[PDB]
């Protein structure tokens, strides 16, 4: 066919595929530095 079955067929959907917003939100996430007592 022209359009591969993996795109539209629900049976062939990749379980490990993730959304398009969460990974980038996580990357933009800023974690405050681990503040120790001396260093």
């Amino acid at each position: 066919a022209n359009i591969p079955r993996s795109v539209w067929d629900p049976a062939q959907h990749n379980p490990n595929w993730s959304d398009s917003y969460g990974h980038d939100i996580t990357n933009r996430r800023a974690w405050p530095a681990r503040k120790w007592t001396v260093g």
């Binding site: 066919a1 990749n14 490990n16 595929w17």
Partner: protein
């Protein structure tokens, strides 16, 4: 070979652009394209491979190809069976199945959460980097140095079979290529070449050997024929030549002369005969 090294047709797409990030993003797009296209094509090839393994019939053309050689490895004449031919086919199709499965698994590996398209082991196809073409020019202004630059990325697809459908879908990329980006295609494919010992025979080195004069300046145009040199396939029969006399004069066997000239039962003087190609 097995795994990554093994393949039959290697396609390389050299993508050229004016900016490294432009070409990188175009390479990512083309990979996400070719990954799925090759996945579907290798899938529909795997179906046929599995069906052929489950059971099939031997082609008489294939069996004749196997029992074509005059003398085999074991002594002289050899006689293969369709069962043996099917065993050879089974071995080839098993290795093809392994290659197709490796391709499919590598196609399924990459995922947005963790993807690396520059590693041949992780994804299929993989992108390898190529040194940018840089041309610096210095000119009056008091002098100024400005350099043209052109960045490249090579997308490599190694398939264990020739798919003209895949070649078509790969060629059709230039129509939706990215803005101000170009592409060129390199194809390395396995092709069968015959060495016809009849048109190109092995002969004793002539009595009078060539000297350096025959390989002089402008000798390539005046002294030498283009290979191959024509060898007369047609002969005329001399006077009173016996059937074996003609064969001996042609250096061919009587049986093969008969096979070549089965039209005529007997030889008459001045008639035209067809010299067998293997005549020495």
């Amino acid at each position: 070979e097995d795994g990554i090294r093994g393949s039959e047709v290697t396609y390389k797409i050299v993508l050229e652009g004016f900016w490294d990030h432009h070409v990188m993003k175009l390479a990512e797009d083309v990979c996400m394209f070719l990954k799925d296209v090759g996945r579907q094509i290798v899938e529909e090839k795997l179906v046929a491979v599995r069906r052929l393994l489950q059971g099939g019939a031997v082609d008489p053309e294939l069996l004749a190809a196997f029992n074509c050689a005059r003398a085999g490895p074991f002594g002289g004449y050899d006689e293969y069976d369709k069962e043996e031919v099917a065993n050879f086919l089974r071995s080839d199709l098993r290795r093809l199945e392994e290659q197709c499965l490796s391709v499919i698994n590598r196609c399924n590996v990459p995922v947005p959460g963790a993807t690396n398209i520059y590693d041949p082991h992780t994804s299929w196809p993989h992108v390898e980097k190529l040194e940018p073409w840089v041309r610096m020019a210095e000119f009056w202004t008091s002098t100024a140095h400005y350099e043209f630059r052109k960045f490249f990325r090579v997308i490599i697809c190694k398939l264990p079979f020739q798919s003209t459908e895949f070649e078509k879908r790969m060629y059709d990329i230039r129509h939706w290529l990215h803005r101000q980006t170009s592409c060129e295609f390199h194809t390395i494919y396995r092709r069968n070449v015959i060495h016809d010992s009849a048109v190109f025979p092995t002969e004793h080195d002539p009595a009078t050997p060539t000297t350096h004069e025959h390989h002089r300046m402008f000798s390539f145009a005046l002294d030498w024929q283009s290979a191959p040199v024509n060898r007369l396939s047609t002969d005329t029969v001399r006077e009173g030549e016996n059937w074996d006399a003609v064969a001996q004069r042609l250096g061919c066997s009587v049986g093969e002369l008969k096979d070549a000239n089965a039209e005529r039962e007997t030889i008459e003087a001045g008639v035209v005969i067809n010299v067998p190609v293997t005549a020495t």
